[PDB]
Design a protein around this ligand. Structure first.
Ligand SMILES: *[C@@H]1O[C@H](CO)[C@@H](O[C@@H]2O[C@H](CO)[C@@H](O)[C@H](O)[C@H]2NC(C)=O)[C@H](O)[C@H]1NC(C)=O
Ligand SMILES: *[C@@H]1O[C@H](CO)[C@@H](O[C@@H]2O[C@H](CO)[C@@H](O)[C@H](O)[C@H]2NC(C)=O)[C@H](O)[C@H]1NC(C)=O
Ligand SMILES: *[C@@H]1O[C@H](CO)[C@@H](O)[C@H](O)[C@H]1NC(C)=O
Ligand SMILES: *[C@@H]1O[C@H](CO)[C@@H](O)[C@H](O)[C@H]1NC(C)=O
Ligand SMILES: *[C@@H]1O[C@H](CO)[C@@H](O)[C@H](O)[C@H]1NC(C)=O
Ligand SMILES: *[C@@H]1O[C@H](CO)[C@@H](O)[C@H](O)[C@H]1NC(C)=O
Ligand SMILES: *[C@@H]1O[C@H](CO)[C@@H](O)[C@H](O)[C@H]1NC(C)=O
Ligand SMILES: *[C@@H]1O[C@H](CO)[C@@H](O)[C@H](O)[C@H]1NC(C)=O
Ligand SMILES: *[C@@H]1O[C@H](CO)[C@@H](O)[C@H](O)[C@H]1NC(C)=O
Ligand SMILES: *[C@@H]1O[C@H](CO)[C@@H](O)[C@H](O)[C@H]1NC(C)=O
Lengths: 346, 370, 214, 50, 198
């Protein structure tokens, strides 16, 4: 593999090189925040309405209280993650009707009231690109009670005590948070992150940012139209890059695929025998007398407890990783949206 | 659930509701004949171990409680199936083999057991879902001069692989010298007789053994036990006993296109989903009846005692039924709390933008809001 | 005789069980025909040695449109000395026999509808195997050499005979043509559709791409 | 061994889960080394004078 | 005659995969990032590299810490001598004490001792009568040999799951430290820092 193209700077102790022109660029970055919240019922999963299995499980131990507590803590942690990354503003702003921000476009980002959900164009493209599965309780035990020629996995995972909790914050309030942050950044600048919002036109705000980065503010007012055209072309290139290639949201697709694969493995684990003569509790309780059926049920319960411990431990590790990524996303939102950051390549 | 006498403010998950079954439905095939176990057990003579007789039993009704009357045997010890559970569930085909062996060879008729008889006379499979009945016959199959009617095979060029019988007798070639039908020094007769005398010990007495090989799954059932049938019912969460395959769920009409040799419908998680009725050729979908999680929404015990119940993920147009106020959410529906048009901060969460609180009304109650 | 070798392609897949499955991928281990194997083509012309060994599974094929093939004789030897299996079908009702009559103990006479429901090319296909005393019959009629398509064979007729078979032969009423394929234990992955019919399959021990798919 | 593999096959996809997790660990170290070090697009070269 | 543990881990099914980047390719990346800081300053981290002498390159960075640039141009040789003395002193400090590289040694030692305690647990019996499969399948017939094999498989699977969990936790810790190293590399080599004691 090639490490890269070769370059060599012609360095001498009397030679300096300064630029004569600039270029405004727009770069995207994707970070996960939350995942699919789940909850596991022990008695419906391990036994499936068998009284002898329930008696052996209550005779066994108290692992299910620990598992339910761990999954509840993971769910509360996911809600805390979304709350911490998004709701950082104190008052929900709204945009003025006049949309002349010094020649800048600002139309693909601000929401429009034509859609039933107040979502802009790029959020619509982002939501259309991700092949979302298991949104929540969109079924409400209605379709699964009906008859389908090709039964999907989702009804099977609902019938075995593996539910998916809906999130506390749905899509509309997230869109309202993002619209409020856009309105604050466009109108007020960074002053809404410190105290109240202080109104300022966009040209003096761009002069403030150029004075921050180290360029004298006379450059902006002599080059306003070129900056506006380059910004509009960059927004158009970003929109075309999202509309053309569907391989840009790989991390979020990986999160959804990981959760779907984990629940599929947890459902498909019950098809095995774990050293017992049959994988069906009903066949064991019907074919055998009490003691040998207790032996086979003991083996099956030990295997299912081992599988559930493995799934819960993997879910906890994934929750810690997604929490670290969400904290990095929250501090990037705090230090880059609400202000100007001088750290290089942050 | 929380093992505490006081609980704090918040939402708690306690237990799960389940619709209890109503009645019992048993469906068995329409077979009226009686299986001839008496002809197998009350016979004058039994064939030899190398030429064991195989009897096919099908298209009848088997009573396994009458076997103790026919033969005075020790016990009915079995692999994979119990003696006491034979009459409840039922099978497809019954295979009965009977032969006579010595007392030393009783221990080697078993799955995974090898030896002399198991290698040269009668070999059982490893997954053999049947069992044997052995009893002493020193008062019938023994003579003072010696009962020479029974033979066994000592020599074979290979081991036995299961459910096979050897009939032809050939002189064994134990060396490089060919035999060609002559019993020479390295050529021996393949059969030797049993020496049965009443003066011998208990380890060498004759024993009449009968093995009952049973087949499980497929092949729509021809032999079943004496339990009567029950009329079929649909669209009710009832118990069902279909050919011995018990369960609990809702029986309903199905539109699946089964092939005529197919009778069972399996889910992804290896669970029966579609079933074939043994009386009339119709296909029924098996779905479990309604269940789900139950959430308890409450303020603190120091404040109040009023409690709102959240039924998790189920429509309560079909709830198994507690106040009079019903509000529908995306996560389920809420019972015991009303709904207001005011917008407050979230005191306790539910999900999908629904929050509850304990607030004044006139006068203290539990209200829900966006 | 005209012993010829042709590519077997993908014409040896059948339902391994009597269980309905819809839109699921199930992996089974059973005796099967390997994909892209060679079968043996015979032009049996009578005015030739029909001695063919069993070798743990026989895959039978016939592209003849007319009802000229009558039956099959099975067993170890055919000399009226040991047990031999004697399916004879007189094109009215099939008769199964266990007796060992030379060019005519269970004695299982299954007298019912014949195995040869046929009256385009109308190729016929049979798969014979014997595990735990059970001679199976799988048969399908494909109106189309071996075509580039799939046809799942169904367990329509079962035989509880329990004998030992080594040598088999064919029966005629001289333009006989049939294909003989052999069965070896292998692992397959079978794709069921929404209707419960096998439409796609893959051998797990043919190619690294196929092993990666498995 | 064959029969021990047959008895291991009676268990579920435990070894499908464990082999997949260690592969996910093994792909992650390459990402760490690429993210930490490969932060420059072009391979630069120093002048011969020092 | 003296067999190492590497061969035992090799034949017991515990392979070790090689890294994608070799030792030479990382050295070329580090040489390139040294050639960017000397001859271009922090300008190569933002856009394209710009040629600039080291005098005004050092004089720029005193303006970031609140010292005017006349101090460097009036004290250049003293600063150069102090830099050379510091480089020689840190070379002698790394050349003398071998205990400074404690962090990179534990990454090798943890994985080595984890593989060593995984391989060593095959000599355990796990409730059976022998630690060798071939002994109990030469001695016992299959009906209870299945139970003995089941006990051994249960013990080995529990040990393997424990090892996989420990590897997952160690990889998460190394990922967190690698992201800290990545942001330190991106902030302190490619540019100047106003964060005190970063
Ligand atoms: C700085 O770069 C911009 C490019 O964005 C230059 O603008 C271009 O000027 C040429 C002049 O011939 C036009 O043909 C292009 O259409 C302009 N591009 C855009 C996007 O407007 C600008 O001229 C450069 N500055 C200087 C001093 O040359
Ligand atoms: C801001 O950008 C939007 C998005 O491209 C521009 O709207 C498009 O303008 C072209 C030019 O005629 C039309 O063909 C498209 O139909 C417009 N799209 C939509 C959705 O209206 C818009 O012109 C730009 N400028 C301003 C001031 O809004
Ligand atoms: C600049 O570099 C040249 C080349 O090595 C060297 O001779 C000279 O002393 C340096 N300094 C000045 C001030 O020219
Ligand atoms: C047996 O099955 C049902 C039971 O009611 C009946 O309709 C059918 O005619 C019966 N058949 C025979 C042969 O008895
Ligand atoms: C078995 O039943 C027959 C009736 O068929 C009877 O004559 C005989 O005495 C019974 N007992 C024995 C040991 O044969
Ligand atoms: C609940 O039931 C009603 C009527 O039975 C139906 O209209 C509705 O779609 C169902 N689902 C929800 C989520 O309300
Ligand atoms: C089948 O056998 C023939 C003759 O041995 C041979 O020519 C042909 O290549 C074989 N087919 C294969 C290997 O696919
Ligand atoms: C099996 O029974 C048939 C019935 O007639 C007979 O012809 C044949 O000889 C028998 N075979 C034996 C006893 O081996
Ligand atoms: C059938 O006979 C052959 C000898 O021709 C023998 O090797 C085999 O074990 C026998 N049994 C079977 C196939 O079950
Ligand atoms: C399944 O059967 C229906 C009924 O005719 C048919 O329309 C459909 O095409 C079949 N599915 C496939 C994949 O052929």
């Amino acid at each position: 593999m090639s490490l890269g193209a070769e370059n060599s700077v012609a360095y001498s102790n009397n030679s300096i090189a300064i630029p004569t022109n600039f270029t405004i660029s727009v770069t995207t970055e994707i970070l996960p925040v939350s995942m699919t919240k789940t909850s596991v019922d022990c008695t419906m999963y391990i036994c499936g309405d068998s009284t002898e299995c329930s008696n052996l499980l209550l005779q066994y131990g108290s692992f299910c209280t620990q598992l339910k507590r761990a999954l509840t803590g993971i769910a509360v942690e996911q809600d805390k993650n979304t709350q911490e990354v998004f709701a950082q503003v104190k008052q929900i702003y709204k945009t003025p009707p006049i949309k002349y921000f010094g020649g800048f476009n600002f139309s693909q980002i601000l929401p429009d009231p034509s859609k039933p959900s107040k979502r802009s164009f790029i959020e619509d493209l982002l939501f259309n690109k991700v092949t979302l599965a298991d949104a929540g309780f969109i079924k409400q035990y209605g379709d699964c009670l009906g008859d389908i020629a090709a039964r999907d996995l989702i009804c099977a995972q609902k019938f075995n005590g593996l539910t998916v909790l809906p999130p506390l914050l749905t899509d509309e309030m997230i869109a309202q948070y993002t619209s409020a942050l856009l309105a604050g950044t466009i109108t007020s600048g960074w002053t809404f992150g410190a105290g109240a919002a202080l109104q300022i036109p966009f040209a003096m705000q761009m002069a403030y940012r150029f004075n921050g980065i180290g360029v004298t503010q006379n450059v902006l007012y002599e080059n306003q139209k070129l900056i506006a055209n380059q910004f509009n072309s960059a927004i158009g290139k970003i929109q075309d890059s999202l509309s053309s290639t569907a391989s840009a949201l790989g991390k979020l697709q990986d999160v959804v695929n990981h959760n779907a694969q984990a629940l599929n493995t947890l459902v498909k684990q019950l098809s095995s025998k774990f050293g017992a003569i049959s994988s069906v509790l009903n066949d064991i309780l019907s074919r055998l007398d009490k003691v040998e059926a207790e032996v086979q049920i003991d083996r099956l319960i030990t295997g299912r407890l081992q599988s559930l411990q493995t799934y819960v431990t993997q879910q906890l590790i994934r929750a810690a990783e997604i929490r670290a990524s969400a904290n990095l996303a929250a501090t990037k939102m705090s230090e880059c949206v609400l202000g100007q950051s001088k750290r290089v390549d942050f | 659930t929380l093992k505490s006498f006081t609980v704090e403010k918040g939402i708690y998950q306690t237990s799960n509701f389940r619709v209890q079954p109503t009645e019992s439905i048993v469906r068995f095939p329409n077979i009226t004949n009686l299986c001839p176990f008496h002809e197998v057990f009350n016979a004058t003579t039994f064939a030899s171990v190398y030429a064991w007789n195989r009897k096919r039993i099908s298209n009848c009704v088997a009573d396994y409680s009458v076997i103790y009357n026919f033969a005075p045997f020790f016990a009915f010890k079995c692999y994979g199936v119990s003696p006491t559970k034979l009459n409840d569930l039922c099978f497809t085909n019954v295979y009965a083999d009977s032969f006579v062996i010595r007392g030393n060879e009783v221990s080697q008729i078993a799955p995974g057991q090898t030896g002399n008889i198991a290698d040269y006379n009668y070999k059982l499979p490893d997954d053999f879902t049947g069992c044997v009945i052995a009893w002493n016959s020193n008062k019938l199959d023994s003579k003072p001069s010696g009962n020479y009617n029974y033979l066994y095979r000592l020599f074979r060029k290979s081991k036995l692989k299961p459910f096979e019988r050897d009939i032809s007798t050939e002189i064994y070639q134990a060396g490089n010298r060919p035999c060609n039908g002559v019993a020479g020094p390295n050529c021996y007769s393949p059969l030797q007789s049993y020496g049965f005398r009443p003066t011998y010990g208990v380890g060498h007495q004759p024993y009449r053994v009968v093995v009952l090989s049973f087949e499980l799954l497929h092949a729509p059932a021809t032999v079943c036990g004496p339990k009567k049938s029950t009329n079929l019912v649909k669209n009710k969460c009832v118990n069902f006993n279909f050919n011995g395959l018990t369960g609990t769920g809702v029986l309903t009409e199905s539109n699946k296109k089964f092939l005529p040799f197919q009778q069972f419908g399996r889910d992804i998680a290896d669970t029966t989903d579609a079933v074939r009725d043994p009386q009339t050729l119709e296909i029924l979908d098996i779905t479990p009846c309604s269940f789900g999680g139950v959430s308890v929404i409450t303020p603190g015990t120091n404040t109040s005692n009023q409690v709102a119940v959240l039924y998790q993920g189920v429509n309560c147009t079909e709830v198994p039924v507690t106040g009079s106020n019903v509000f529908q959410t995306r996560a389920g529906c809420l019972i015991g709390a009303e709904y207001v048009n005011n917008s407050y901060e979230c005191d306790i969460p539910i999900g999908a933008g629904i929050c509850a609180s304990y607030q004044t009304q006139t006068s203290q109650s539990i209200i829900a809001y966006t | 005789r005209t012993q010829s070798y042709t590519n077997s392609f993908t014409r040896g897949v059948y339902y391994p069980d009597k269980v309905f499955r819809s839109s699921v991928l199930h992996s089974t281990q059973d005796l099967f025909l390997p994909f892209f194997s060679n079968v043996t083509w015979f032009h049996a012309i009578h005015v030739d040695n029909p001695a063919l060994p069993f070798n743990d599974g026989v895959y039978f094929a016939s592209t003849e449109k007319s009802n000229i093939i009558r039956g099959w004789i099975f067993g170890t030897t055919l000399d009226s000395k040991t047990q031999s299996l004697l399916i004879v079908n007189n094109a009215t009702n099939v008769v199964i026999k266990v007796c060992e009559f030379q060019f005519c103990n269970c004695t299982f006479e299954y007298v019912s509808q014949p195995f040869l429901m046929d009256l385009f090319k109308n190729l016929r296909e049979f798969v014979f195997k014997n595990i735990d005393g059970y001679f199976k019959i799988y048969s399908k009629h494909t109106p189309i050499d071996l075509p580039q398509g799939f046809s799942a064979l169904e367990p329509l007729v079962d035989l509880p005979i329990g004998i030992n078979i080594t040598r088999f032969q064919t029966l005629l009423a001289g333009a006989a043509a049939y294909y003989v394929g052999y069965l070896q234990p292998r692992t397959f992955l079978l794709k069921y559709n929404e209707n419960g019919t096998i439409t796609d399959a893959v051998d797990c021990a043919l190619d690294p791409l196929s092993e990666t798919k498995c």
